[PDB]
Amino acid sequence: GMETLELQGAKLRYHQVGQGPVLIFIPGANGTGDIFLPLAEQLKDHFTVVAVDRRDYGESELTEPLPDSASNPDSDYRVKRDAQDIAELAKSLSDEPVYILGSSSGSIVAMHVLKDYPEVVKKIAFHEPPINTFLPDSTYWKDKNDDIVHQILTEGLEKGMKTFGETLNIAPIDAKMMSQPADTEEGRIEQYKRTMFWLEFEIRQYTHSNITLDDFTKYSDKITLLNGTDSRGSFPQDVNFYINKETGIPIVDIPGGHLGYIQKPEGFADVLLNMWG
Amino acid sequence: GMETLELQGAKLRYHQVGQGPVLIFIPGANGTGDIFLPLAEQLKDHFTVVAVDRRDYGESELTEPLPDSASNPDSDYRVKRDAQDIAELAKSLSDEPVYILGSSSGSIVAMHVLKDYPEVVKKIAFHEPPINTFLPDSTYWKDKNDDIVHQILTEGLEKGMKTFGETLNIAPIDAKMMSQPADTEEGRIEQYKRTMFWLEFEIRQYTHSNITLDDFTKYSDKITLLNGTDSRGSFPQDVNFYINKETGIPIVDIPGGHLGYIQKPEGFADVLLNMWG
Ligand SMILES: *C(=O)N(NC(=O)OC)c1ccccc1
Numbered sequence: 176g177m178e179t180l181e182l183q184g185a186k187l188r189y190h191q192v193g194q195g196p197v198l199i200f201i202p203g204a205n206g207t208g209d210i211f212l213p214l215a216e217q218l219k220d221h222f223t224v225v226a227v228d229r230r231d232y233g234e235s236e237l238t239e240p241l242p243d244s245a246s247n248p249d250s251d252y253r254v255k256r257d258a259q260d261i262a263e264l265a266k267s268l269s270d271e272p273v274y275i276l277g278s279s280s281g282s283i284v285a286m287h288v289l290k291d292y293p294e295v296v297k298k299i300a301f302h303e304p305p306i307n308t309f310l311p312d313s314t315y316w317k318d319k320n321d322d323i324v325h326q327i328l329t330e331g332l333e334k335g336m337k338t339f340g341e342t343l344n345i346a347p348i349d350a351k352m353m354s355q356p357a358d359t360e361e362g363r364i365e366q367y368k369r370t371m372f373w374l375e376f377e378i379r380q381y382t383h384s385n386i387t388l389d390d391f392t393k394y395s396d397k398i399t400l401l402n403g404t405d406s407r408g409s410f411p412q413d414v415n416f417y418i419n420k421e422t423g424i425p426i427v428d429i430p431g432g433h434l435g436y437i438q439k440p441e442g443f444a445d446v447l448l449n450m451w452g
Numbered sequence: 453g454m455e456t457l458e459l460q461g462a463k464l465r466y467h468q469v470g471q472g473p474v475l476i477f478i479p480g481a482n483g484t485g486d487i488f489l490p491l492a493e494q495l496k497d498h499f500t501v502v503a504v505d506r507r508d509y510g511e512s513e514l515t516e517p518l519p520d521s522a523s524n525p526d527s528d529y530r531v532k533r534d535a536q537d538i539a540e541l542a543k544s545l546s547d548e549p550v551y552i553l554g555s556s557s558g559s560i561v562a563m564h565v566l567k568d569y570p571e572v573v574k575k576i577a578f579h580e581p582p583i584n585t586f587l588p589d590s591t592y593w594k595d596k597n598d599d600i601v602h603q604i605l606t607e608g609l610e611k612g613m614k615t616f617g618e619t620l621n622i623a624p625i626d627a628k629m630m631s632q633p634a635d636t637e638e639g640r641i642e643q644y645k646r647t648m649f650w651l652e653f654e655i656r657q658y659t660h661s662n663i664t665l666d667d668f669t670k671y672s673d674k675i676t677l678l679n680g681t682d683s684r685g686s687f688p689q690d691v692n693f694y695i696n697k698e699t700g701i702p703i704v705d706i707p708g709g710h711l712g713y714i715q716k717p718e719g720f721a722d723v724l725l726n727m728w729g
Pocket residue numbers: 203204205278279280305620630655659688710
């Protein structure tokens with residue numbers, strides 16, 4: 176029941192109420208136009224009020240993924256695309272320049288609409304903008320933003336992964352290898368994305384998934400449990416000891432630790448060939 | 453030069469090396485089959501080694517978005533879909549049941565292959581599985597996993613946003629509304645996701661984007677700066693004061709704080725109507 180404008184790479188959804196000249200509201204960090212609906216009610220007698228879900232939020236939908244460069248802190252892709260979305264929206268609703276109000280990061284989008292598409296702007300209002308670029312003390316504010324993001328995204332991840340390693344009693348050879356930063360900068364960023372994905376979407380879901388001891392017993396003739404020789408004392412080995420205790424399925428010891436198939440591939444292969452070759 | 457199998461909702465990419473019966477390697481948290489290539493080199497005279505990029509990783513690609521529910525810690529969509537991928541891969545490559553080895557969370561995928569598609573399994577190996585569901589101390593391990601994930605996600609964000617609000621001298625009323633938990637577990641998942649997105653993809657990129665005072669002066673007749681009456685002393689108001697000092701563009705005071713358009717919609721509208729009505 177929201178309105179839709181199909182744009183390059185997204186379906187932009189927006190609320191529309193009232194009659195009269197167009198007044199576009201651009202949301203801040205919440206990203207969604209619903210926050211303006213009580214205000215639009217007060218204005219709907221004077222304006223056609225348009226409250227946008229910016230394309231990354233709410234009921235708007237991307238039709239292709241964000242470019243990889245958007246994670247760079249100096250990327251201008253998103254802010255320019257958001258501004259162009261507003262301009263295209265204005266042109267789709269009005270043959271005349273429109274009224275625009277943005278708040279917070281939405282006021283920065285509004286600044287870029289005026290810069291890149293001044294022809295669509297009749298009047299514009301910047302409500303409490305947090306932009307720092309043109310300030311005399313820009314560096315202080317930029318560094319504070321960079322440091323808070325770094326602390327949240329990087330330090331929090333680093334410390335919780337160390338805790339996860341300690342909780343499972345992972346061996347030093349595996350700990351040292353699982354945390355090795357990738358060589359390239361492309362590999363460092365992908366490694367971060369993969370870790371955050373595994374964290375949110377894999378670890379809890381998979382480790383508490385629906386496997387019972389009875390599932391092992393039905394096909395026990397097919398199964399080998401493998402324990403590394405260099406990862407003794409770790410939690411996964413205790414899982415295999417419990418399966419063995421309750422099912423009788425044999426444990427075969429195999430060279431290396433948790434990552435033994437890449438630490439000691441010759442010896443790992445030798446055991447697999449003894450099993451199955 | 454990876455191979456591709458096109459499946460429901462994904463293009464599954466894999467390495468294939470060697471000759472002989474099919475041996476599928478399922479990766480753990482790294483998600484990608486390249487970790488098995490040194491091992492494949494040792495096995496390639498005895499097996500057709502197939503080392504998979506699971507569909508959410510590496511050179512595999514989704515062709516449809518994940519379900520929204522996949523972020524739920526109780527979801528089993530992904531592990532079941534991973535297991536179905538391996539079964540379809542086996543049937544595409546072999547008319548006999550195949551050999552399968554999984555490590556870490558890949559061993560859990562392997563367990564679901566055996567459970568749901570035993571007809572594709574000749575022999576299977578579970579290398580160091582971290583599954584806890586059937587353990588006698590399952591609650592301890594499940595609750596640890598949930599606690600570490602929550603700590604890395606949600607909580608590190610909570611602390612950084614408190615520093616952010618102090619650094620910018622955000623009004624308590626605003627910091628209160630901005631930080632209010634949603635009244636649903638799932639609404640809270642969504643709200644954390646939105647903050648995490650804004651942190652990584654918006655705050656740095658937008659607040660240090662390319663806007664100069666010259667961009668304002670060119671169109672000063674069109675611009676109003678808005679300061680809330682309930683957010684005095686905060687950094688966004690200092691930005692407006694600087695713009696006004698240097699350009700003469702007027703500041704209008706408007707009811708509410710940083711979120712005044714929803715806190716005080718009638719008073720906010722009255723000012724906008726005075727400006728533009
Ligand atoms: C704007 O809405 N926000 N940004 C800001 O004030 O300075 C960058 C914001 C709103 C809610 C949560 C976090 C930031």
